[PDB]
Enzyme design. Structure first.
Site, PDB file in Angstrom:
ATOM      1  N   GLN A   1       0.812  -1.215   0.000  1.00 59.03           N
ATOM      2  CA  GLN A   1       0.000   0.000   0.000  1.00 59.03           C
ATOM      3  C   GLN A   1       0.851   1.275   0.000  1.00 59.03           C
ATOM      4  O   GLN A   1       0.647   2.150  -0.842  1.00 59.03           O
ATOM      5  CB  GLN A   1      -0.951   0.006   1.189  1.00 59.03           C
TER       6      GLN A   1
ATOM      7  N   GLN B   1       0.896   3.792  -3.142  1.00 59.86           N
ATOM      8  CA  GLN B   1       0.280   5.113  -3.054  1.00 59.86           C
ATOM      9  C   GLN B   1       1.313   6.227  -3.227  1.00 59.86           C
ATOM     10  O   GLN B   1       0.998   7.276  -3.810  1.00 59.86           O
ATOM     11  CB  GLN B   1      -0.493   5.254  -1.735  1.00 59.86           C
TER      12      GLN B   1
ATOM     13  N   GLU C   1      -2.890  -7.635  -2.107  1.00 60.82           N
ATOM     14  CA  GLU C   1      -4.341  -7.571  -2.238  1.00 60.82           C
ATOM     15  C   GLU C   1      -4.658  -6.473  -3.226  1.00 60.82           C
ATOM     16  O   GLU C   1      -3.817  -5.596  -3.489  1.00 60.82           O
ATOM     17  CB  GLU C   1      -5.039  -7.352  -0.881  1.00 60.82           C
TER      18      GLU C   1
ATOM     19  N   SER D   1       6.963   0.360   2.474  1.00 64.15           N
ATOM     20  CA  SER D   1       7.027   0.606   3.911  1.00 64.15           C
ATOM     21  C   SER D   1       7.906  -0.431   4.604  1.00 64.15           C
ATOM     22  O   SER D   1       8.029  -1.576   4.148  1.00 64.15           O
ATOM     23  CB  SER D   1       5.631   0.583   4.535  1.00 64.15           C
TER      24      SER D   1
ATOM     25  N   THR E   1      -0.298   2.637  12.333  1.00 64.23           N
ATOM     26  CA  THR E   1       0.640   1.527  12.325  1.00 64.23           C
ATOM     27  C   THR E   1      -0.012   0.284  12.891  1.00 64.23           C
ATOM     28  O   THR E   1      -0.981   0.358  13.658  1.00 64.23           O
ATOM     29  CB  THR E   1       1.873   1.831  13.172  1.00 64.23           C
TER      30      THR E   1
ATOM     31  N   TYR F   1      -3.286  10.494   3.831  1.00 62.88           N
ATOM     32  CA  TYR F   1      -2.261   9.835   3.024  1.00 62.88           C
ATOM     33  C   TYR F   1      -1.943  10.647   1.773  1.00 62.88           C
ATOM     34  O   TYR F   1      -0.792  10.678   1.327  1.00 62.88           O
ATOM     35  CB  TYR F   1      -2.705   8.414   2.632  1.00 62.88           C
TER      36      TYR F   1
ATOM     37  N   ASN G   1       1.653  12.030   1.012  1.00 64.50           N
ATOM     38  CA  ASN G   1       2.300  11.454  -0.161  1.00 64.50           C
ATOM     39  C   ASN G   1       2.705  12.522  -1.155  1.00 64.50           C
ATOM     40  O   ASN G   1       3.743  12.389  -1.809  1.00 64.50           O
ATOM     41  CB  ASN G   1       1.388  10.404  -0.813  1.00 64.50           C
TER      42      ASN G   1
ATOM     43  N   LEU H   1      22.534   5.896 -11.161  1.00 65.01           N
ATOM     44  CA  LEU H   1      22.306   5.342  -9.828  1.00 65.01           C
ATOM     45  C   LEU H   1      23.608   5.078  -9.080  1.00 65.01           C
ATOM     46  O   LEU H   1      23.673   5.257  -7.860  1.00 65.01           O
ATOM     47  CB  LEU H   1      21.501   4.048  -9.945  1.00 65.01           C
TER      48      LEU H   1
ATOM     49  N   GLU I   1      26.195   6.837  -8.999  1.00 63.52           N
ATOM     50  CA  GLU I   1      26.747   8.057  -8.421  1.00 63.52           C
ATOM     51  C   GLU I   1      26.178   8.329  -7.030  1.00 63.52           C
ATOM     52  O   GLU I   1      26.873   8.909  -6.186  1.00 63.52           O
ATOM     53  CB  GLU I   1      26.487   9.237  -9.363  1.00 63.52           C
TER      54      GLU I   1
HETATM   55  N1  GTP Z   1       3.551   7.818   4.010  1.00 62.87           N
HETATM   56  C1  GTP Z   1       2.724   6.820   3.794  1.00 62.87           C
HETATM   57  N2  GTP Z   1       2.699   5.761   4.663  1.00 62.87           N
HETATM   58  C2  GTP Z   1       1.828   4.754   4.426  1.00 62.87           C
HETATM   59  C3  GTP Z   1       0.961   4.762   3.340  1.00 62.87           C
HETATM   60  N3  GTP Z   1       0.238   3.603   3.395  1.00 62.87           N
HETATM   61  C4  GTP Z   1       0.648   2.890   4.464  1.00 62.87           C
HETATM   62  N4  GTP Z   1       1.618   3.598   5.116  1.00 62.87           N
HETATM   63  C5  GTP Z   1       2.402   3.211   6.295  1.00 62.87           C
HETATM   64  O1  GTP Z   1       2.902   1.913   5.971  1.00 62.87           O
HETATM   65  C6  GTP Z   1       2.869   1.064   7.108  1.00 62.87           C
HETATM   66  C7  GTP Z   1       1.863  -0.063   6.859  1.00 62.87           C
HETATM   67  O2  GTP Z   1       2.253  -0.818   5.741  1.00 62.87           O
HETATM   68  P1  GTP Z   1       1.452  -0.901   4.361  1.00 62.87           P
HETATM   69  O3  GTP Z   1       2.296  -0.403   3.212  1.00 62.87           O
HETATM   70  O4  GTP Z   1       0.096  -0.230   4.416  1.00 62.87           O
HETATM   71  O5  GTP Z   1       1.236  -2.503   4.329  1.00 62.87           O
HETATM   72  P2  GTP Z   1       1.486  -3.468   3.079  1.00 62.87           P
HETATM   73  O6  GTP Z   1       2.872  -3.371   2.451  1.00 62.87           O
HETATM   74  O7  GTP Z   1       0.425  -3.243   2.051  1.00 62.87           O
HETATM   75  O8  GTP Z   1       1.439  -4.926   3.740  1.00 62.87           O
HETATM   76  P3  GTP Z   1       0.097  -5.695   4.203  1.00 62.87           P
HETATM   77  O9  GTP Z   1      -1.151  -4.865   3.988  1.00 62.87           O
HETATM   78  O10 GTP Z   1       0.321  -5.988   5.648  1.00 62.87           O
HETATM   79  O11 GTP Z   1       0.073  -6.947   3.355  1.00 62.87           O
HETATM   80  C8  GTP Z   1       2.373   1.920   8.262  1.00 62.87           C
HETATM   81  O12 GTP Z   1       3.498   2.368   8.987  1.00 62.87           O
HETATM   82  C9  GTP Z   1       1.623   3.056   7.583  1.00 62.87           C
HETATM   83  O13 GTP Z   1       1.577   4.246   8.340  1.00 62.87           O
HETATM   84  C10 GTP Z   1       0.987   5.854   2.452  1.00 62.87           C
HETATM   85  O14 GTP Z   1       0.253   5.944   1.445  1.00 62.87           O
HETATM   86  N5  GTP Z   1       1.875   6.870   2.715  1.00 62.87           N
HETATM   87  N1  918 Z   2     -12.419  -4.743  15.925  1.00 57.78           N
HETATM   88  C1  918 Z   2     -11.191  -4.283  15.794  1.00 57.78           C
HETATM   89  C2  918 Z   2     -10.947  -3.141  15.059  1.00 57.78           C
HETATM   90  C3  918 Z   2      -9.657  -2.641  14.903  1.00 57.78           C
HETATM   91  C4  918 Z   2      -9.447  -1.459  14.144  1.00 57.78           C
HETATM   92  F1  918 Z   2     -10.568  -0.811  13.940  1.00 57.78           F
HETATM   93  F2  918 Z   2      -8.981  -1.734  12.999  1.00 57.78           F
HETATM   94  F3  918 Z   2      -8.636  -0.662  14.741  1.00 57.78           F
HETATM   95  C5  918 Z   2      -8.615  -3.347  15.526  1.00 57.78           C
HETATM   96  C6  918 Z   2      -7.257  -3.031  15.463  1.00 57.78           C
HETATM   97  C7  918 Z   2      -6.433  -3.014  16.586  1.00 57.78           C
HETATM   98  C8  918 Z   2      -5.093  -2.706  16.375  1.00 57.78           C
HETATM   99  N2  918 Z   2      -4.223  -2.653  17.339  1.00 57.78           N
HETATM  100  C9  918 Z   2      -2.866  -2.200  17.093  1.00 57.78           C
HETATM  101  C10 918 Z   2      -2.319  -1.942  18.459  1.00 57.78           C
HETATM  102  C11 918 Z   2      -3.023  -2.984  19.288  1.00 57.78           C
HETATM  103  C12 918 Z   2      -4.415  -2.982  18.740  1.00 57.78           C
HETATM  104  N3  918 Z   2      -4.620  -2.450  15.164  1.00 57.78           N
HETATM  105  C13 918 Z   2      -5.433  -2.470  14.107  1.00 57.78           C
HETATM  106  N4  918 Z   2      -4.951  -2.210  12.878  1.00 57.78           N
HETATM  107  C14 918 Z   2      -5.886  -2.191  11.730  1.00 57.78           C
HETATM  108  C15 918 Z   2      -5.188  -2.422  10.413  1.00 57.78           C
HETATM  109  O1  918 Z   2      -3.973  -1.712  10.352  1.00 57.78           O
HETATM  110  C16 918 Z   2      -3.045  -2.225  11.274  1.00 57.78           C
HETATM  111  C17 918 Z   2      -3.488  -1.995  12.690  1.00 57.78           C
HETATM  112  N5  918 Z   2      -6.729  -2.776  14.269  1.00 57.78           N
HETATM  113  C18 918 Z   2      -8.909  -4.496  16.241  1.00 57.78           C
HETATM  114  N6  918 Z   2     -10.203  -4.944  16.367  1.00 57.78           N
HETATM  115 MG    MG Z   3      -1.725  -3.898   2.389  1.00 53.16          MG
END
Ligand code: GTP
Ligand code: 918
Ligand code: MG
Ligand code: ACP
Ligand code: GDP
Ligand code: CA
Ligand code: CA
Ligand code: CA
Ligand code: CA
Ligand code: MG
Ligand code: MG
Lengths: 54, 423, 331, 440
Positions: D11, D15, D71, D140, D179, D224, D228, D252, D254
């Protein structure tokens, strides 16, 4: 303080400023590690299915 | 993407039906399965819980299970009763007599293959199945015994899918039979092994909320179930509505469960009021951490939070939210483990639930939940030491040793919580 | 409320600050490793400044300036004074000093030595022969000109040093505590033999252990400003402010302004304050000499309450307000 | 002319890639449909922008880019967005279900099943290159895909393109920007595995990006998109030298030659100025924006360079800047700031000026300025961000919290401690390079 390596074009320029002088894993090895992790997953799933069969 | 919902037994089907009423209203689905909402946000992730039938109808991905027909006749006559896929009602005629062994080993065993056939049909047309959610009680026979038999069979057929339950724990304050602690002790061990997340809904806490806070002098199961469906709607908001979160079931379990057996959550909700008044963000945040708003009758100040999710709904200041979340964490500084950094998640969804400008759902993985299991354990032991009411179970082919093991398993779980409460 | 952590259980000053904070009802002490604090009273060594200021929503204040050690280590102070243009190799209020390893100044030391009263102090060994001083080191040290002509208190013919407490807050305001202490020697000054350390070292420990008639002229061998100023009036027809304290204020300002760009926490993601102990000598011409700067000083017993309260008002509550004993050194 | 291929993973990678390629098209006058009216060579060319864009017969300019996610919902936005027509379908690669914030799932379980397809699609971009330089990899640290699949891909790229440079743009986790709780684990696991495969890596801490948006852009709750578009300005000033005529950082290699004397210590600190709210402004001078490069609050990672040592320092200006002004600013700053170099390095600055001012997205939050600068400095101070990350790892790992999720995907517990010892070694490397001994 000296300017060296000054290059100019129509887009911009570049130069250096000096203030003071000074004083791999093969394809096979990666696939072994990935296959090993697969086998460990398969072993754990087999233990689960054995447990459920019990 | 897709989630398969299962609801089993009387409690499971009565709470299940309300969950589908609440979330159908939120997604703009009327009782004919026709969409009549006004926002594309309602349809963006409708496929998580609904199939689209050909006539532009949305049909819950829901399987309704019982060992007697009465409650499922009530669901079918109910408000949203026509929305469910008629093929997805799976019921016998015998009943389970509030007996876990009938649900798990005799009557339930006769019906379970037919339920798995329906599960398989639903899973087969899933583009990418997330997993399963089961609603049931632990104190009866069908939801408790057949429900955990179902979970075990589903795990065998889909070992790599997430399994969640919303599980109603019995309380002598709101009790149908004396054998409830037996049924609940047998079930808990099943859940320790075969769910990834279990939302622990304690009927004692629900009653005490209705009586003390909502000022309902004579709470009914319907009053209890209004609380549960509101909480269930809140916990699933992050799945059902387009946030920035990008959450699925596996992500939820990864972030809430630091140790595989400690996956039993205290839910909570705010507001609960005995009302048109504007609820400010400080009040929302303070209420959702108040023990009195919690639905597992456990004092969080008696334990420590491993992980917390706090889900705010409605149009409010994100800045105010964060200030209050920080403030409430200061007031509870001693009640968060310090060795999981940033273990309190804040989430905001802009769509408010029906009839509230804002609300908050609390999900705590707290070591205080050990009080719930200790309570059950004591009630179990008070009877089991005299082998009282055991003939109902040995008459179904169970041996006393299986009770000894289930009791030992629960005491182990309690000790596990106490180990991390002191880390 | 406000939260704080304690990571130096051996600090007499911050034991009292923490004790005061709790008795306001608006501060709460957390476990040492809880990251969610407002105020850190940190450890003297290896303080993890790099982990400060990253907690979302938390304003974070620590009682040490990262980089202040450059002033508070003996060798470092010498290097800082010689190589800082605002201080310069010329600066008049610091005794000629040299850094000597057992970047090394062993050769320029002997040069100035041969150019010569030729008594030096390595740091302890005071001697008039260079050979004795260098053999001592090999057995990092600084060799400093030893002030052969100190100002002697009467009666007693006794040497002393002045300790000044200085508080630098998060805005880099420099606050000199009104109350200083003279730490006096009890045995009279003897220029003939530096073998006997007791009358050449005014360390409070050395007087308590080595000096008979310790505490003879003033309690605990400590003299305070009221008495000292009164002495300077009676004996020297001058005041403490005019003859000494003007130089002390000048020296404190010079030292702290010199390092301000390197340590200031303005525009930093966390904030610092720090209490300093400056030690001065006074020669017989009423010239004031800086001896050293202490980064983790103690206080005189009778001054703990006032000064620790002052730290709370000036350094802590200025950042975390609740529901002058200092002289502000302008710059 | 030598080509660069961009790879966007997960993601955050996807993005940010969108924001960059949008900005690139604006900087080069490429419309969303891929047409570039100013390009008089139809269907070909070896111009400077051709390092990032190939060309079709219809005159469409196609990013040399592949998007990878486990995904489909993030990359689906690409397929239907403003710049949908820019990319070929083969360039946008999606899986079924994601890594669930789990490195082991992105690397072992799911990664093993999609890695060969990714490589095949990258090979197709590579076969269209007369002289490929290497790769820019955006991801990330914290995501299961961004961490776990990226590290697998970097390993294979070292195998399949051994002589090619690989640069990273890596998002470092911050709780202010949503996070997962296991992001310290994922960050250490991916850094350990990727370290020997990356020649130069630009870390961007979401904490610094968030705070710049709050403080300079006066955005209370940055999105975001807000973050971004700011990141893409910094990325664009780092990559400008590959896409425009110039003489500094033109390939690259350099970047490594100029910013990385020791291979493991390959994480330069980026600092950017000025960032001005478009909703406002007085134009800052060369001296003012160069001075801003030594303010902690303008850095991509929050740390204190005054308490470290420099090994290299590159100043990349855009807009109305002449060399004389730069030297007048540097002379001023050297007498006022704590700029200490390591002893075995020249105390100096490589300067690049590109006369075109920053392009900004119409309707964005960033005001158009007449001059801006990005400073790239390899300072030991950035080790503070490793120390913070390693400490959070240590707290959770001492209780083995969440480890069972990684072991359940076939990872051994020993990979955790191996990764952590490598990080400890990395912290010791910075410590040896950057600190003078303190006296007891
Ligand atoms: N700056 C910035 N950070 C992002 C963005 N999207 C996600 N993050 C950060 O990236 C970390 C989460 O990882 P993601 O890139 O969303 O996850 P992913 O690589 O898609 O991996 P999974 O969804 O777990 O399969 C977190 O620290 C977020 O704050 C974005 O568009 N910009
Ligand atoms: N019913 C739910 C709903 C949520 C949500 F709404 F997504 F926050 C969560 C939850 C808790 C969590 N924690 C991180 C610190 C400990 C609890 N991190 C997350 N997320 C959602 C997806 O991005 C990663 C972190 N999700 C759990 N149960
Ligand atoms: Mg993802
Ligand atoms: N150049 C000099 N001339 C004369 N006396 C000196 C001197 N340098 C040091 N001294 C004496 O030595 C004593 C201790 O010196 P110094 O302060 O350097 O050691 P120290 O750090 O262990 C004690 P503290 O930390 O309490 O200041 C001082 O009280 C002073 O009397
Ligand atoms: N909250 C709630 N609890 C219920 C409901 N119906 C039954 N219970 C509780 O569930 C337990 C009885 O189980 P039940 O579901 O009726 O038996 P089953 O049909 O065999 O699964 C007892 O603890 C009851 O207090 C209900 O509608 N709501
Ligand atoms: Ca039968
Ligand atoms: Ca069958
Ligand atoms: Ca062309
Ligand atoms: Ca390589
Ligand atoms: Mg019943
Ligand atoms: Mg000292």
């Amino acid at each position: 303080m000296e300017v060296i390596e000054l290059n100019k074009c129509t887009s911009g320029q570049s130069f250096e400023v000096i203030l003071k002088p000074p004083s791999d894993p093969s394809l096979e090895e990666i696939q072994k590690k990935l296959e090993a992790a697969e086998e460990r997953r398969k072993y754990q799933e087999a233990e689960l299915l054995k447990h459920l069969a019990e | 993407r897709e989630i398969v919902h299962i609801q089993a037994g009387q409690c499971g089907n009565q709470i299940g039906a309300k969950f589908w009423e609440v979330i159908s209203d939120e997604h703009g689905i009327d009782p004919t399965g026709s969409y009549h909402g006004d926002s594309d946000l309602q349809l963006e992730r409708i496929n998580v819980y609904y199939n689209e039938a050909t006539g532009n109808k949305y049909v819950p991905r829901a399987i309704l299970v019982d060992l007697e027909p009465g409650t499922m006749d009530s669901v079918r006559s109910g408000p949203f009763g026509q929305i469910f896929r008629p093929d997805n009602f799976v019921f016998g005629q015998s009943g389970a007599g509030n007996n876990w062994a009938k649900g798990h080993y005799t009557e339930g065993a006769e019906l379970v293959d037919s339920v798995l056939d329906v599960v398989r049909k639903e899973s087969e047309s899933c583009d990418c199945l997330q997993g399963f959610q089961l609603t049931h009680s632990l104190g009866g026979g069908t939801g408790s015994g057949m429900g955990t038999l179902l979970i075990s069979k589903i795990r065998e057929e889909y070992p790599d899918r997430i399994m969640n339950t919303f599980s109603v724990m019995p309380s002598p304050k709101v009790s149908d039979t004396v054998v409830e602690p037996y049924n609940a002790t047998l079930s808990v061990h099943q859940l320790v092994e075969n769910t990834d997340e279990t939302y622990c809904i304690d009927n004692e806490a629900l009653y005490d909320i209705c009586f003390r806070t909502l000022k309902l002098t004579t709470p009914t199961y319907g009053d209890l179930n209004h609380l549960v469906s509101a909480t269930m709607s809140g916990v699933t908001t992050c799945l059902r509505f387009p946030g920035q979160l990008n959450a699925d079931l596996r992500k939820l379990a990864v972030n809430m469960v630091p140790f595989p057996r400690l996956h039993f959550f205290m839910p909570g909700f705010a507001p609960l009021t005995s009302q048109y008044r504007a609820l400010t963000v400080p009040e929302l945040t303070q209420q959702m951490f108040d023990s009195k708003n919690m639905m597992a009758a456990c004092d969080p100040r008696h334990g420590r939070y491993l992980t917390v999710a706090a889900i705010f709904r409605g149009r409010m200041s994100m800045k105010e939210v964060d200030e209050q979340m920080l403030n409430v964490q200061n007031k509870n500084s001693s009640y968060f483990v310090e060795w999981i950094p940033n273990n309190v998640k804040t989430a905001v969804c802009d769509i408010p639930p029906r009839g509230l400008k804002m609300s908050a759902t609390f999900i705590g993985n707290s070591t205080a939940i050990q009080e719930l299991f200790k309570r059950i354990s004591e009630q179990f032991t008070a009877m089991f030491r005299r082998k009282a009411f055991l003939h109902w179970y040995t008459g179904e082919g169970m041996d006393e040793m299986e009770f000894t093991e289930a009791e030992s398993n629960m005491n182990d779980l309690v000790s596990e919580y106490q180990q991390y409460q002191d880390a | 409320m406000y939260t704080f952590v304690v990571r130096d259980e051996n600090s007499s000053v911050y034991a009292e600050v923490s004790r005061l904070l709790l008795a306001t009802g608006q501060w709460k002490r957390l476990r040492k490793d809880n990251p969610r604090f407002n105020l850190m009273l940190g450890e003297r060594n290896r303080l993890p400044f790099g982990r400060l200021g990253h907690e979302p929503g938390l304003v974070q204040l620590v009682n040490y300036y990262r980089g202040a050690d450059k002033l508070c280590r003996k060798a470092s102070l010498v290097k800082l004074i010689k190589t800082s243009p605002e201080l310069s190799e010329s600066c008049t209020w610091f005794p000629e000093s040299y850094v000597i390893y057992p970047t090394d100044e062993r050769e320029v030391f002997l040069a100035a030595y041969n150019r010569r009263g030729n008594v030096w102090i390595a740091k302890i060994l005071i001697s008039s022969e260079a050979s004795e001083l260098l053999d001592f080191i090999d057995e990092v040290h600084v060799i400093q000109k030893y002030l052969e002509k100190p100002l002697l208190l009467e009666p007693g013919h006794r040497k002393f040093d002045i300790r000044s407490w200085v508080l630098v807050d998060h805005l880099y305001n420099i606050y000199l505590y009104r109350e200083g202490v003279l730490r006096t020697s009890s045995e009279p000054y003897n220029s003939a033999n530096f073998q006997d350390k007791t009358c050449h070292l005014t360390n409070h420990c050395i007087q308590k252990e080595y000096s008979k008639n310790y505490g003879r002229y003033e309690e605990g061998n400590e003299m305070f400003f009221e008495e000292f100023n009164q002495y300077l009036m009676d004996a020297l027809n001058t005041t403490l402010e005019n003859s000494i304290l003007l130089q002390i204020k000048h020296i404190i300002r010079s030292c702290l302004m010199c390092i301000e760009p390197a340590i200031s926490t303005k525009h930093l993601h966390y904030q610092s304050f720090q209490l300093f102990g400056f030690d001065f000598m006074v020669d017989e011409e009423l010239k004031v000499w800086l001896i050293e700067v202490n980064g983790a000083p103690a206080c005189a017993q009778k001054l703990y309450a006032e000064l620790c309260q002052g730290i709370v008002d000036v350094a802590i509550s200025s950042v975390f307000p609740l529901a002058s004993i200092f002289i502000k050194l302008h710059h | 002319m030598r080509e660069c291929i961009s790879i966007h993973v997960g993601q955050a990678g996807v993005q940010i890639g969108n924001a960059c390629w949008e900005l690139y098209c604006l900087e080069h006058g490429i419309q969303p449909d891929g047409q570039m009216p100013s390009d008089k060579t139809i269907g070909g060319g070896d111009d400077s922008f051709n390092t990032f864009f190939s060309e079709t017969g219809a005159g469409k300019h196609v990013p040399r880019a592949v998007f990878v996610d486990l995904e489909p919902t993030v990359i689906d936005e690409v397929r239907t967005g403003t710049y949908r027509q820019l990319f070929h379908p083969e360039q946008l690669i999606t899986g079924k279900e994601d890594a669930a914030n789990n490195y082991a799932r992105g690397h072992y379980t799911i990664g093993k099943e999609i890695i060969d397809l990714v490589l095949d699609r990258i090979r197709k971009l590579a076969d269209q290159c007369t002289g490929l330089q290497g790769f820019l990899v955006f991801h990330s640290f914290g995501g299961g895909t961004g961490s776990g699949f990226t590290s697998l891909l970097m390993e294979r790229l070292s195998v399949d393109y051994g002589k090619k440079s690989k640069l990273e743009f890596s998002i470092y986790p911050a709780p202010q920007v949503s996070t997962a709780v296991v992001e310290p684990y994922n960050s250490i696991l991916t850094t350990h595995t990727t370290l020997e495969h990356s020649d130069c890596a630009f870390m961007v801490d979401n904490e610094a990006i968030y705070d710049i948006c709050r403080r300079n852009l006066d955005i209370e709750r940055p999105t975001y998109t807000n973050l971004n578009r700011l990141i893409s300005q910094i990325v664009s000033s780092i990559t400008a030298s590959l896409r425009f005529d110039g003489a500094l950082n033109v390939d690259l290699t350099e970047f490594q030659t100029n910013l990385v004397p020791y291979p493991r210590i390959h994480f330069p600190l980026a600092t950017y100025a000025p960032v001005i709210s478009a909703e406002k402004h007085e134009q800052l001078s060369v001296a003012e924006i160069t001075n801003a490069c030594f303010e902690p609050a303008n850095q991509m990672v929050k740390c204190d360079p005054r308490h470290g040592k420099y090994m290299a320092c590159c100043l990349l200006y855009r807009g109305d800047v002449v060399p004389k002004d730069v030297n007048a600013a540097i002379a001023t700053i050297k007498t006022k700031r704590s700029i200490q170099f390591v002893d075995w390095c020249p105390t100096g600055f490589k300067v690049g000026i590109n006369y075109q001012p920053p392009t900004v997205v119409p309707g964005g939050d960033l005001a158009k300025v007449q001059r801006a600068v990005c400073m790239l400095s390899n300072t030991t101070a950035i080790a503070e961000a490793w120390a913070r990350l390693d400490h959070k790892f240590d707290l959770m790992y001492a209780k083995r919290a969440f480890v069972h999720w990684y072991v359940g995907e076939g990872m051994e517990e020993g990979e955790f401690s191996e990764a952590r010892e490598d990080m400890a070694a990395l912290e010791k490397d910075y410590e040896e390079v950057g600190v003078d001994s303190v006296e007891g």
